[PDB]
Amino acid sequence: DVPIEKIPEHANVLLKKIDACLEILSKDIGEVTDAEAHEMYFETSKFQILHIY
Amino acid sequence: PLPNAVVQGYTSVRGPKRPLDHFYGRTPLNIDTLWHWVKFPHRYDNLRFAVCFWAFLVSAHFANKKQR
Numbered sequence: 001d002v003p004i005e006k007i008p009e010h011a012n013v014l015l016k017k018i019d020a021c022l023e024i025l026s027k028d029i030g031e032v033t034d035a036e037a038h039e040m041y042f043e044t045s046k047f048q049i050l051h052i053y
Numbered sequence: 054p055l056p057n058a059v060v061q062g063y064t065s066v067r068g069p070k071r072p073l074d075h076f077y078g079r080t081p082l083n084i085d086t087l088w089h090w091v092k093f094p095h096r097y098d099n100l101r102f103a104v105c106f107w108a109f110l111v112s113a114h115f116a117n118k119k120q121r
């Protein structure tokens with residue numbers, strides 16, 4: 001009850017689905033740049049921080 | 054003294070560690086990130102001087118009256 005010509009339609013559907021998946025999963029989160037997350041890297045330096053202006 | 058497995062923390066395969074969450078759009082909340090919310094007392098220092106004087110004086114008054 002399933003002819004062979006109807007298969008590429010299903011293949012098109014699944015290709016659309018997996019492309020909608022991969023266009024999202026191709027994105028990834030980079031390294032964090034918030035200074036509040038890395039202020040202790042500077043707090044723990046071997047010398048005190050110079051606020052130079 | 055100790056094997057390289059113990060030093061590196063794995064026998065065969067180094068397992069991935071889940072990184073720390075950041076909570077974008079707000080400050081980190083850790084045991085070391087609390088001075089952002091609680092600084093040293095700075096608002097009622099002059100009231101502290103006055104109240105220490107008055108506390109000393111009232112205590113001395115009532116102690117002397119009790120003793121006498």
Ligand SMILES: CCCCCCCCCCCCO[C@@H]1O[C@H](CO)[C@@H](O[C@H]2O[C@H](CO)[C@@H](O)[C@H](O)[C@H]2O)[C@H](O)[C@H]1O
Pocket residue numbers: 054055059060061062
């Ligand atoms: C020196 C004279 C002869 C005596 C030798 C033996 C001395 C033993 C006492 C020192 C013990 C130190 O114990 C030390 O514990 C830490 C945990 O903090 C282990 O740490 C290990 O596990 C942690 C997490 O659990 C990993 O992230 C880390 O990469 C790995 O090193 C060290 O691998 C171990 O060496």
Ligand SMILES: COCCOCCOCCOc1ccc(C(C)(C)CC(C)(C)C)cc1
Pocket residue numbers: 089090
């Ligand atoms: C055992 O001791 C009890 C400790 O209880 C801690 C109470 O915590 C409640 C803190 O609630 C807040 C919430 C928000 C804030 C703001 C965001 C308003 C503070 C700000 C603007 C200074 C960052 C301050 C305190």
Ligand SMILES: COCCOCCOCCOc1ccc(C(C)(C)CC(C)(C)C)cc1
Pocket residue numbers: 079082087090091
């Ligand atoms: C010496 O310190 C002892 C007590 O420390 C209390 C620290 O409290 C800080 C609490 O951190 C917060 C701050 C804000 C918030 C809210 C929910 C108010 C932030 C919001 C509205 C941006 C989501 C929650 C937790």
